[PDB]
Design a protein around this ligand. Structure first.
Ligand SMILES: Cc1ccc2cc(CC3CCN(C(=O)c4cc(-c5ccccc5)nc5ccccc45)CC3)ccc2n1
Ligand SMILES: Cc1ccc2cc(CC3CCN(C(=O)c4cc(-c5ccccc5)nc5ccccc45)CC3)ccc2n1
Lengths: 681, 681
């Protein structure tokens, strides 16, 4: 384009234009997208705040002569390999003084973003760089999978030993190199390009090729090794630092695995996540089964799958979601979760309240609801709910939120029936679109899996506390769901809880319940060090529902003995139901000692804010001791810590405990430093 | 029955008869089944061996006044709770001097084997007892799930405040107790059985019941807490000790979860594993959808599911399988895997060999094949293959085996297509039986999951080394399998490998291959501390198959430039294929350094036996150092250890290294004890 006001970026650097022709942002332009998203982050938090350009810094990372990563400022497109990375230092609302993370990305313009050995080792090197520092690792996927190739240098000289030069159509015995060929190879110092066995047949000496190696690196299995290297590297990263991936253009083979292994993923619409392309699969099946890769790995697959946690309309939207997601996680591994108080202060009642005879969206209880007569506040901070995995297993709702500024993972139950429509596979003619009815308050294979996935994702890397508004009748025990292994997924939940490292709150909501099958997987004893359970005064819980209980312990016979109190079975049947229901109250739960407290929904925000803040504080103190006295149970630690509180402080008063502790952090630190004396030598 | 030769056991103890009427062995008779199975174990190993009754000892475990477990010899049926346990000490072929394990079981005759709080705490107490000692925990499931009940004492006295004594059909306002009732309760010291509010209405004073608590323990949520307690307890046990469960009669609710959480499970035919019973589910759906619980949790569900690893014709068969399974695992956590040499010695060639143009069952390569001209030996010890999870995801084959006596987990690939027939769910009228074609050498969601499950099951509790005869073309990238999340299951494999703690051998078989998608998940770099890869001289590996490679790097144009070597596309197309194929040889793998060695199938048993034995030995030495010098990478440890070998010993000679090490264990132990001097104070 001639005569533009400013320089034509796409001309100054043709690679930028190639990227665009490919439907993705040029890799070197992504740091600018992060600056833009970060700026927006501020405007949304505080319209005023005068922001300067030093609030965002991006330094490209490359390997020095010794293979170690260092920072450089160079012209975009100078990358010698197809993988690039940047260290981002950015001041944000949660971290005004700045937080850091790295961004690794394929360069779709460099050999179609293929993963060659060098790209793989660079990617691995960047992952370790992030893990060592404990900072988040953002991956931007735009690739063609493992790099392929043949030893081109052997193509113009190989000879074929036919069964008879007369009719080639008769076949060949092997391929070989003449003494002339062996020479052409030695002339270019490419003798290792081939493995041969010198044998003379009638005419001349023919070196039979037993194996083709090639002089150029990155043709086959060496690309597979590096492929596995970064797969395992990413598997580890996920249990270590916050990991996330943006699928910004196709992501193929190892590319698709990196997306899942990183777990948290945002798919830009129209950018497929595939294993094998449609053309190839069509060859596998014989006919023209698939039209595009989007049928195999588009958002309708992966987002409905749970592989993609969120979809983005474009690259910038993807970056914004990443930035939004990061606002809930620690600046780095083991640092405190980022407190961020906003307009919606902790001290207030909860407005929206569910009713037994009225349908509702659990999201209203979570983030509040907008009504004609004004906004009704929910349990958590207004506008702080960030839902994820929203395109899969709608039976359960998961996301991040803030409670008076405290970030945490939230799991709620969708009470409304879900219409899960499964498309028909083109590969099968006899296939027809299928509709699955997923009853509310019932775990299914998908929703059980999602529940566990969320717990693990809240725990690993995010290191967030969690609240589960437990409200399930049980798991689906029908044949299809049972055959579909609902037990394995249900069990994944218990496993996830056992592994949780931050405070957990299990709370049965106002019109909610827990029964024999559901309570099993969320009881506080699964992980007593982190879990606490609470039931609303209007919640219910017992092994069986009232109907089921009477149908077994208040049979027709016993129902008649009661006729001796005053045809009339209808009303008496109702009486027995109420008799049973009077057993499933929060009061019995308190009496039997299975919950910490029974609560009143409207007061829940106030109670949980201080309960959580109080816990974050004691936990902090407990960890400090776990690095001193060492050998000591949690019971002994938490007890010693509480022995330091002033005698008149009421251990049961959350607000008092939290308040006294924050007033004496340094004083408590002195008592700890002085405890080092307990250095059993 | 009168006039029997010996006492009528079922009469002496009626509970034994009740158990039988229920289709299961009386709990106290199970130890005898273990003795029988153990005796058989010997006969099968050595027909001769004169066995005495002291080779098997079973001591029931009960809680003493302080709640601690102790041994007792008492009359069967004296159990005050519905859960029982035994400590078994038994000499076996693998452990001639004896090995121990515990057996916990529901007593189906005690309150239908329901899980009450006491049963739950006993079960938990036994699990910890086993974990502390590091011994296997066998669970025999025969139950009705969580115990239920109502406060019976409140049934004969509750009163109802009708809207008008005239027409009860009009409803009631609440239930209450008269001053007479409150007295009946105080007379039996059951005042807490109810929560009321004294209010006087016209007539007398009526105490409105707000909550029914009940005096008897085990009615509701207290059964749910204990339920969650043992769920989490079992979740932990699985990552700690060898865990296994025999479903000997129905296993309900928490009962079904215990089976999965324990992971390894053997289902006796006709004994259902269910969440909710058919009658109840029929109520849920309205109509008479299900006939029996077997439709919901019978072997056709759970065995085809992968929830049940094996099925047994009867209780005794179940016990035998348990005993057989245990013969491959350490007597207790962290003890060496049980070496058990048999007739089939290590020093011999492998007979059965696959052919490219011939269908075969991978089991033949594993355990050998019986033919008309005699027995053809496989890679592993004759008769040592114990397949598991054989009713699910047949695309992959898993089991335990012995290599010259060394036990290990084995994973092989089923090359034959699998006909996976999925029954139709009665709940859906529009449902029809479905047939799934699972191509061989291709991972599917189920087979990927099974592959990972096996790795985790070999690692946790079993603590076994592993060999994977890696032979997959890739994962199924079609729509259905992609939508069914094959990526998540594929990723589970990488996770399992990362967590493996024993030596691992990845070996591409004689006619096998690995490609871009499959190699990703089994490369040695995923876990370099334990993994080693090998390729047969007749194996193949590269990113793409030859067809795919030519279709991209040897297009029609380039194919014509080759026409200048001597219509004839057919033969030249064949030529290009061979050109590509010459790239995917074990030789290139060795050159690029991606495998430890290329091998010859017939010599594999000899090579692997000494390679594994050599490794088990170095690993042992490495752990000893990991308890001394501590802070040191594996590279530094393995290096120091090898520095102790005699200078003339060839580190690369497996047999020599293993042999010298076993000759100097004690001498090496002295060098270690002397290394304690390195006690950086
Ligand atoms: C339902 C389903 C889904 C995915 C499956 C994947 C495989 C293995 C891979 C290995 C690697 N591979 C090839 O290497 C290959 C690629 C291409 C191809 C490449 C680029 C464009 C178009 C086609 N064409 C071929 C034809 C015949 C044999 C192999 C090929 C693809 C095939 C096997 C069964 C499958 N079944
Ligand atoms: C496809 C599917 C499969 C399993 C499902 C499980 C539930 C929850 C449980 C809670 C506990 N429960 C009861 O408590 C109950 C039990 C029995 C019952 C008990 C013994 C014998 C026969 C029936 N009858 C009832 C009728 C109405 C309401 C509840 C009951 C069973 C119902 C919800 C939806 C389901 N959908």
């Amino acid at each position: 384009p001639i005569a533009t006001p400013y320089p034509v970026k796409e001309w100054l650097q043709p690679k930028r234009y190639k990227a665009h022709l490919m439907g993705t942002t040029y890799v070197y332009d992504f740091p600018e997208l992060f600056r833009q998203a970060s700026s927006s982050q501020w405007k949304n938090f505080s319209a005023d705040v005068k922001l300067t350009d030093d609030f965002f810094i991006s330094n490209e990372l490359i390997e020095d002569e010794n293979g170690e990563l260092t920072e450089v400022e160079r012209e975009p497109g100078a990358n010698a390999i197809g993988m690039v990375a940047f260290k981002i230092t950015v001041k944000t609302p949660e971290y005004p003084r700045g937080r850091q993370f790295v961004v690794v990305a394929n360069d779709i313009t460099f050999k179609i973003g293929s993963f060659g050995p060098q790209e793989d080792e660079f990617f691995n090197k960047v992952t370790e760089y992030a893990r060592k520092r404990g900072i988040p690792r953002i991956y931007l996927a735009a690739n063609s999978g493992a790099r392929i190739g043949m030893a081109e240098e052997i193509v113009p000289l190989f000879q074929v030993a036919w069964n008879d030069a007369a009719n080639p159509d008769k076949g060949f015995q092997y391929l070989y190199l003449t003494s002339e060929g062996m020479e052409t190879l030695k002339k270019f110092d490419k003798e290792n390009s081939v493995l041969t066995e010198r044998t003379v047949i009638n005419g001349e000496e023919r070196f039979v090729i037993k194996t083709i190696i090639g002089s150029e690196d990155g043709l086959g299995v060496e690309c597979l090794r590096g492929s596995g290297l970064i797969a395992g590297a990413t598997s580890r990263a996920y249990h270590d630092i916050f990991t996330i991936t943006l699928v910004t253009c196709r992501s193929v083979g190892i590319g698709a695995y990196l997306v899942r292994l990183g777990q948290r993923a945002i798919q830009v619409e129209g950018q497929p996540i595939i294993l094998t392309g449609a053309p190839a699969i069509n060859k596998m099946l014989g006919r023209e089964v698939y039209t595009s890769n989007l049928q195999l790995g588009g958002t309708q697959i992966m987002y409905n799958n749970g592989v993609s946690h969120l979809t983005a309309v474009d690259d910038l939207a993807g970056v914004e979601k990443i930035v939004e997601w990061m606002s809930y996680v620690p600046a780095k591994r083991n640092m405190p979760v980022p407190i961020l108080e906003t307009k919606d202060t902790w001290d207030r009642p909860v407005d929206f309240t569910p009713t037994n005879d009225e349908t509702y969206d659990v999201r209203w209880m979570i983030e509040g609801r907008e009504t004609e007569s004004g906004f009704e506040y929910g349990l958590f901070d207004k506008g702080s709910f960030f839902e994820t995995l929203s395109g899969w297993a709608k039976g359960v709702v998961v996301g991040r939120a803030r409670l008076g500024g405290i970030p945490l993972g939230v799991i709620g139950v969708e009470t409304r029936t879900v219409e899960n429509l499964i498309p028909a596979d083109p590969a099968n003619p006899n296939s027809a679109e299928t509709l699955i009815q997923e009853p509310g308050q019932v775990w299914h294979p998908n929703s059980a899996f999602k529940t566990a996935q969320a717990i693990n994702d809240f725990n690993n890397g995010e290191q967030l506390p969690m609240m589960i508004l437990a409200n399930w009748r049980g798991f689906s025990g029908g044949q299809r769901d049972m055959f579909n292994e609902v037990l394995k997924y249900g069990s994944f939940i218990v496993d996830a809880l056992v592994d949780y490292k931050q405070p957990i709150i299990i709370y049965i909501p106002p019109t909610g319940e827990l029964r024999g099958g559901s309570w099993v997987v969320v009881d506080p004893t699964i992980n007593a060090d982190q879990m606490e359970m609470y039931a609303d005064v209007n919640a219910r819980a017992g092994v069986l529902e009232p109907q089921g209980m009477v149908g077994i312990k208040f049979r027709r016979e016993k129902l008649l003995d009661t006729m001796n109190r005053l045809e009339l079975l209808p009303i008496y049947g109702q009486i027995s139901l109420q008799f049973a229901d009077l057993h499933d109250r929060s009061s019995r739960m308190v009496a039997k000692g299975v919950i910490s407290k029974e609560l009143e929904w409207t007061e829940a925000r106030r109670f949980f804010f201080w309960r959580l803040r109080r816990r974050l504080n004691e936990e902090y103190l407990i960890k400090r001791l776990s690095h001193q006295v060492g050998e000591a149970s949690r019971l002994e630690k938490i007890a010693r810590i509480r022995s330091w509180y002033p005698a008149s402080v009421d251990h049961e008063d959350d607000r008092q405990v939290a308040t006294w502790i924050e007033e004496n952090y340094k004083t408590l630190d002195d008592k700890l430093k002085g405890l080092k004396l307990e250095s059993f030598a």
